[PDB]
Amino acid sequence: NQPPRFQNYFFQSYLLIYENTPVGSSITQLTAVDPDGEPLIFGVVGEEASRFFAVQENTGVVWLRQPLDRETKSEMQVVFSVSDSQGVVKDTVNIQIGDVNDNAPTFHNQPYTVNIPEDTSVGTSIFMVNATDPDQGTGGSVLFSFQPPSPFFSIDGARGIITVSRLLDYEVTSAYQLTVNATDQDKLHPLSSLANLAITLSDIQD
Amino acid sequence: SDDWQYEECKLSRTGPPATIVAIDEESPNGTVLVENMQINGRARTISLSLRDNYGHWVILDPVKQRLYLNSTGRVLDRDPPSYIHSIVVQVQCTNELVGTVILHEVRIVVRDRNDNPPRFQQPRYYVAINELTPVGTTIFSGFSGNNGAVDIDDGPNGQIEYTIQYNPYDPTANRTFDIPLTLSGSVVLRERLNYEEITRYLVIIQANDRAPDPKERLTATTTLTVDVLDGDDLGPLE
Numbered sequence: 001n002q003p004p005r006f007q008n009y010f011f012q013s014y015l016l017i018y019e020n021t022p023v024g025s026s027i028t029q030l031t032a033v034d035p036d037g038e039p040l041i042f043g044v045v046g047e048e049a050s051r052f053f054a055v056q057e058n059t060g061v062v063w064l065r066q067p068l069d070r071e072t073k074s075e076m077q078v079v080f081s082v083s084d085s086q087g088v089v090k091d092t093v094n095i096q097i098g099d100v101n102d103n104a105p106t107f108h109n110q111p112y113t114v115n116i117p118e119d120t121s122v123g124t125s126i127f128m129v130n131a132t133d134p135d136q137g138t139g140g141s142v143l144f145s146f147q148p149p150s151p152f153f154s155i156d157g158a159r160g161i162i163t164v165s166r167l168l169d170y171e172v173t174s175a176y177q178l179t180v181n182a183t184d185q186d187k188l189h190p191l192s193s194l195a196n197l198a199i200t201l202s203d204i205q206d
Numbered sequence: 207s208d209d210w211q212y213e214e215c216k217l218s219r220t221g222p223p224a225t226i227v228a229i230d231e232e233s234p235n236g237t238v239l240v241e242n243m244q245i246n247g248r249a250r251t252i253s254l255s256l257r258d259n260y261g262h263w264v265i266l267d268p269v270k271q272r273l274y275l276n277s278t279g280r281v282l283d284r285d286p287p288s289y290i291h292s293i294v295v296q297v298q299c300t301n302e303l304v305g306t307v308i309l310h311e312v313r314i315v316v317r318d319r320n321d322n323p324p325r326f327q328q329p330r331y332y333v334a335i336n337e338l339t340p341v342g343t344t345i346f347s348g349f350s351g352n353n354g355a356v357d358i359d360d361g362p363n364g365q366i367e368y369t370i371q372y373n374p375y376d377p378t379a380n381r382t383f384d385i386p387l388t389l390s391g392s393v394v395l396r397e398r399l400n401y402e403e404i405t406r407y408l409v410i411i412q413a414n415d416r417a418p419d420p421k422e423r424l425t426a427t428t429t430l431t432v433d434v435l436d437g438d439d440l441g442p443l444e
């Protein structure tokens with residue numbers, strides 16, 4: 001009798017699972033050859049691995065029990081087993097959790113309020129919003145815009161810095177309620193959030 | 207809006223956001239890890255640097271967009287004591303037109319080589335067995351557990367097959383004893399013992415690892431000294 005050998009590619013590299021894979025899905029199917037032709041018994045090994053993965057003994061079908069979150073963990077060293085009548089063979093798989101864009105930008109330091117004189121010069125910086133996003137690359141790069149846009153104030157797309165555009169007038173408008181949108185730059189499925197910005201103006205005697 | 211400039215710093219490849227690559231452990235200094243990062247732009251429409259690069263394992267060439275292994279001084283060891291299973295760095299892309307910053311994770315998955323042999327935890331092994339021991343008895347289990355051979359590699363490269371080899375200084379050792387299962391290392395008695403004929407055997411025991419390619423498998427050997435103890439019975443046998 002000669003022992004069984006695993007055949008799948010990912011003992012040789014890694015296995016990519018996207019974090020959005022739903023509970024009960026088939027990840028993959030373990031395959032093994034035995035020179036003796038005898039039937040084999042597949043399983044998983046390890047306290048951590050067994051909580052996330054179940055293995056059907058005869059098929060070697062691996063399925064997901066608990067959900068994956070790239071934001072908690074992005075790598076797992078998992079051990080699989082395959083057994084004939086003479087004993088157990090074990091090999092480790094490096095599992096990589098692929099990121100999806102499943103978080104939207106979070107605004108910090110809210111709420112946002114501003115109090116400036118009506119005679120504030122054009123060009124003047126008057127606030128800076130900030131947001132973060134835990135997703136990877138484009139999914140976690142944030143752009144800021146006003147929605148709707150304002151003829152009187154503008155916001156730098158990358159830095160979130162707010163400046164005066166046109167001369168202000170308390171006698172006409174003493175206060176502005178603006179909405180800042182924060183969007184990630186995910187190509188396929190982009191996500192966004194809104195923050196209020198309150199600009200009250202104080203009167204000069206002009 | 208000319209969008210030709212928001213799209214700098216994004217990736218012109220597809221697949222996952224992280225850029226994952228496998229390489230062999232103990233790779234030589236200068237090994238290409240990532241050929242081309244495939245970031246839109248020109249490090250001048252952008253600029254690139256490394257964050258989270260502990261032990262400076264990665265060198266960057268910005269113009270090419272190419273990561274190299276920085277290794278002079280030391281070896282990239284996956285096995286104990288080092289336990290370097292993977293290296294993660296961030297390639298930071300500062301977009302020089304609009305001001306965005308994007309982080310491109312690079313995960314290097316370090317592959318195990320069969321670069322370590324099995325090593326017996328004892329210089330030699332020993333058991334004393336009364337001659338009245340029944341045939342078929344498992345007379346030694348000490349190569350199971352963690353006190354037999356140990357191999358610090360991963361999976362098959364670190365898994366042990368035990369066999370009894372022919373001893374020319376003791377030809378009957380391997381006919382009186384057997385390891386029926388190479389992965390356990392349990393030694394079984396095949397033949398009735400006889401204190402008054404042979405009191406000692408030197409059983410040569412080999413451990414090989416199970417690297418897929420047989421030319422790359424490694425070996426250790428030890429001696430199991432079996433002393434036979436004199437047996438007496440109330441009945442008519444001894």
Ligand SMILES: [Ca+2]
Nearest residue numbers: 002034036084
């Ligand atoms: Ca077999």
Ligand SMILES: [Ca+2]
Nearest residue numbers: 069070071102
């Ligand atoms: Ca998630």
Ligand SMILES: [Ca+2]
Nearest residue numbers: 100101102135
């Ligand atoms: Ca995510």
Ligand SMILES: [Ca+2]
Nearest residue numbers: 103135139184
């Ligand atoms: Ca996001």
Ligand SMILES: [Ca+2]
Nearest residue numbers: 169170171206
């Ligand atoms: Ca006025």
Ligand SMILES: [Ca+2]
Nearest residue numbers: 203204205206
């Ligand atoms: Ca006034």
Ligand SMILES: [Ca+2]
Nearest residue numbers: 283284285321
């Ligand atoms: Ca090594």
Ligand SMILES: [Ca+2]
Nearest residue numbers: 285319321359
């Ligand atoms: Ca190794």
Ligand SMILES: [Ca+2]
Nearest residue numbers: 322359363415
């Ligand atoms: Ca080895």
Ligand SMILES: [Ca+2]
Nearest residue numbers: 337400401402
């Ligand atoms: Ca006798």
Ligand SMILES: [Ca+2]
Nearest residue numbers: 436437438444
């Ligand atoms: Ca006797």
Ligand SMILES: [Ca+2]
Nearest residue numbers: 439440441444
């Ligand atoms: Ca007697």
Ligand SMILES: [Ca+2]
Nearest residue numbers: 438439443444
């Ligand atoms: Ca007697």
Ligand SMILES: [K+]
Nearest residue numbers: 011091092361
């Ligand atoms: K492996």
Ligand SMILES: [K+]
Nearest residue numbers: 036037038039
């Ligand atoms: K069969």
